Enzyme design. Structure first.
Site, PDB file in Angstrom:
ATOM      1  N   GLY A  92       0.785  -1.209   0.000  1.00  0.00           N
ATOM      2  CA  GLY A  92       0.000   0.000   0.000  1.00  0.00           C
ATOM      3  C   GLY A  92       0.820   1.264   0.000  1.00  0.00           C
ATOM      4  O   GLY A  92       1.889   1.342  -0.619  1.00  0.00           O
ATOM      5  N   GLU A  93       0.301   2.269   0.692  1.00  0.00           N
ATOM      6  CA  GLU A  93       0.889   3.594   0.655  1.00  0.00           C
ATOM      7  C   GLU A  93       0.874   4.159   2.031  1.00  0.00           C
ATOM      8  O   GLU A  93       0.147   3.678   2.901  1.00  0.00           O
ATOM      9  CB  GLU A  93       0.065   4.543  -0.223  1.00  0.00           C
ATOM     10  CG  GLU A  93      -0.200   4.061  -1.635  1.00  0.00           C
ATOM     11  CD  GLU A  93      -0.964   5.082  -2.461  1.00  0.00           C
ATOM     12  OE1 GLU A  93      -1.794   5.809  -1.862  1.00  0.00           O
ATOM     13  OE2 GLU A  93      -0.733   5.147  -3.699  1.00  0.00           O
TER      14      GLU A  93
ATOM     15  N   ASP B  38      13.788  -6.379  11.186  1.00  0.00           N
ATOM     16  CA  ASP B  38      14.061  -5.605   9.966  1.00  0.00           C
ATOM     17  C   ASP B  38      14.620  -4.216  10.305  1.00  0.00           C
ATOM     18  O   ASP B  38      14.156  -3.209   9.772  1.00  0.00           O
ATOM     19  CB  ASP B  38      12.787  -5.517   9.102  1.00  0.00           C
ATOM     20  CG  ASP B  38      13.039  -4.936   7.705  1.00  0.00           C
ATOM     21  OD1 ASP B  38      13.916  -5.427   6.958  1.00  0.00           O
ATOM     22  OD2 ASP B  38      12.326  -3.985   7.339  1.00  0.00           O
TER      23      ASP B  38
END
Ligand SMILES: NCc1ccc(Oc2ccc3c(c2)B(O)OC3)c(F)c1
Ligand SMILES: NCc1ccc(Oc2ccc3c(c2)B(O)OC3)c(F)c1
Lengths: 388, 388
Positions: free
Chosen positions: B78-79, B188
């Site tokens: 997505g964004e 991460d």
């Protein structure tokens, strides 16, 4: 964002908490199968909620919270049990309704109006419901126990004077008026659904056939609903499509009731359903008294008043005309206070679990087959759970 | 019957109200199709709830409550949008995650830990989440807007002194310590997921790869999770099954980070993934500095300390050994108060919607096919909705 909360707090609303729980629970019950669990999404869903749902289910009210004293009634969708709640030791009547049968016999929505009426009437004429709950097999309704039995039993055990008939009918009238004023037609009035309480005062009992009225005061119904001996002709003809009827139909039944009570048989009795129907349609030339059973002139009139076409039927233009019909003239009670006066027959009862005024029921287990794809059999029953 | 309420009041619980609503809503979304509605039970269910569910949906928080100023980030699920909430006029960052893509790419559960961390950390190092909501297409997360951009951008726009590196790394350490103390491994770590706030102080940003630890302090994971340049070798080898690893792996990454910051390239850079992996496994003989890039003796040591096997890695026996490593010795700040001291680079920003420290994103719509049988695509996202 401020309404919503009140929506969910509202006991009358369909998205109040218990319903939402019914939702997760019914979803889970309807997805937990090896066949469907081959679907990842369904599987990884259940893994998340299967556990807490079980826990929730434990915290809930359940059938095992109650002792079952004895089965006081049984019919085609379930039973009614006398019970005692373990923790509180309070006695109740509890109606079980088979989810399996309701799905099978495609009749899975007749209980909503029963729920709400018994939940919310707050009327002396309407048997109260304290809790509504459910499990994978049944729906349960916990009700105030009416220990006096029904009017069938009374009539089975009594030659009934008019003085009495005047009372009971009177009470039926006020009871039906209450339901009517709540915007509902009873549709299955008959002594069976009339229960005497501890003091021997009527309350209407079964509401599986109730229906809400229009802003007018009518029901568009294309199915005949009721019980042969007491079905009015307007409702019989509705079957043939395009039937527009109203509360008058209950007064028809209140009619038959009084006949049955006084004469001793039903006024359209037969050796068959066809023989009952065909004769109800000829009510004009078919209704007739026995000479021997001498019912009074006033009583005779009240019956025929009810037993006629809807357009001329006593009650067509209000309950008032019914109340002040002269057959109800008496010294004992006024309509202001009838239910606080000394009923005709007060139940003799030994204990809080005396169910002598009910017949003994025999006792002589069938559940859904495992589904292969999602069928949703618990969906009809979402929103049924209710706590005082 | 008394626990239960507290269960549902509890914002952390999965059967708190919003989740229950998510339930009815996702059920409805997943049943409202002509094909499935050929099933009576599904049909007569939707008739009951389809209406109020729509109404509920309106009262809910929705995407249209926000203006979209500009897209400040975009990736494969997505964004992230800069936004302004209409009624309050407050600016936020909002992450959209495509439900369609998450189902397709079979990666539909990585957001739970992100939700809870951002919801509940209550830490200056963890970007806060104010609201989590959803519609048939996306998941939305409304976050405090970090206007300083990320450390990639800073490093892209700066030759970084050690004085600075000492600061930022320090802050990364405290941040990772917070997450660790919450029982979670980040997995991460990299400048991409490091965002500078209004004053230029780090907060960790993306938590899609977080995992809870055992009562021990470990994770049983059989999949490699992370980003090539910063993956530690213990995590690379876990891929080959039977991998038992712990928080040390984040410190590996904190290692690479400092190298990248000081030297200017990553310490296992390549023209390929294979070329990055194979060289990370040879960390023993492969890590090496440029003579020209003269990093200090203390800085040099801290790196190698992190860049080594897990059993000997700085941090193996606590964060303390990291804190009091001499490379962090300085006059400016103590570990008691670093985040209230004058950061190295304070963002120059014109307005509350200045997003100059983010790159311009292009802008160049794919939804589920109508199902024929029940598939349950909205089930993964039940329990996601969250309100402050
Ligand atoms: N249509 C026949 C019928 C009549 C009454 C029914 O329910 C009952 C039966 C007996 C009792 C009750 C309720 B109750 O609240 O106290 C005793 C019932 F379930 C069916
Ligand atoms: N793995 C790369 C990545 C980094 C940051 C992400 O989220 C953001 C991006 C930008 C901002 C925020 C959050 B935020 O709370 O303020 C600005 C994000 F969605 C992905």
């Amino acid at each position: 964002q401020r309404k919503l909360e009140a929506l969910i707090r509202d006991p009358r609303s369909p998205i109040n908490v218990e319903s939402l729980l019914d939702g997760l629970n019914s979803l889970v019950l309807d997805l937990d199968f090896p066949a469907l669990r081959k679907n990842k999404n369904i599987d990884n869903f259940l893994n998340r909620y299967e556990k807490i749902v079980k826990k929730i289910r434990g915290l809930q009210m359940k059938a095992e919270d109650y002792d079952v004293v004895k089965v006081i009634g049984r019919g085609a969708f379930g039973e009614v049990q006398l019970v005692r709640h373990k923790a509180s030791q309070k006695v109740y009547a509890m109606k079980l309704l088979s989810k399996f049968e309701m799905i099978k016999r495609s009749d899975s929505a007749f209980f909503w109006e029963e729920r709400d009426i018994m939940a919310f009437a707050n009327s002396p004429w309407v048997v109260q419901l304290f809790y509504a709950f459910q499990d994978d097999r049944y729906l349960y309704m916990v009700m105030e126990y009416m220990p006096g039995g029904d009017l069938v039993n009374l009539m089975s055990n009594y030659d009934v004077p008019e003085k009495w008939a005047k009372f009971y009918t009177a009470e039926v009238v006020l009871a039906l008026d209450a339901i009517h004023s709540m915007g509902l037609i009873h549709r299955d009035v008959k002594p069976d659904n009339m229960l005497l309480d501890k003091h021997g005062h009527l309350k209407l009992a079964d509401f599986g056939t109730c229906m809400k009225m229009d802003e007018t005061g009518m029901v568009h119904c294309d199915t005949a609903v009721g019980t042969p001996d007491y079905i009015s002709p307007e409702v019989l003809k509705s079957q043939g499509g395009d039937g527009f009827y109203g509360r008058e139909c209950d007064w028809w039944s209140v009619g038959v009731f009084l006949y049955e009570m006084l004469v001793g048989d039903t006024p359209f009795y037969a050796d068959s359903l066809v023989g009952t129907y065909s004769k109800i349609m000829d009510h004009k030339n078919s209704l007739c008294f026995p000479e021997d059973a001498e019912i009074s002139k006033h009583a005779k009139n009240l019956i025929c008043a009810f037993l006629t076409d809807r357009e001329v039927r006593l009650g067509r233009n209000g309950v008032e005309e019914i109340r002040q019909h002269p057959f109800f003239k008496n010294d004992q009670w006024h309509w202001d206070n009838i239910r606080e006066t000394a009923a005709p027959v007060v139940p003799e009862l030994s204990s809080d679990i005396d169910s002598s005024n009910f017949d003994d029921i025999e006792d002589d287990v069938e559940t859904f087959p495992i589904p292969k794809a999602f069928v949703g059999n618990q969906l009809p029953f979402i929103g049924f759970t209710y706590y005082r």
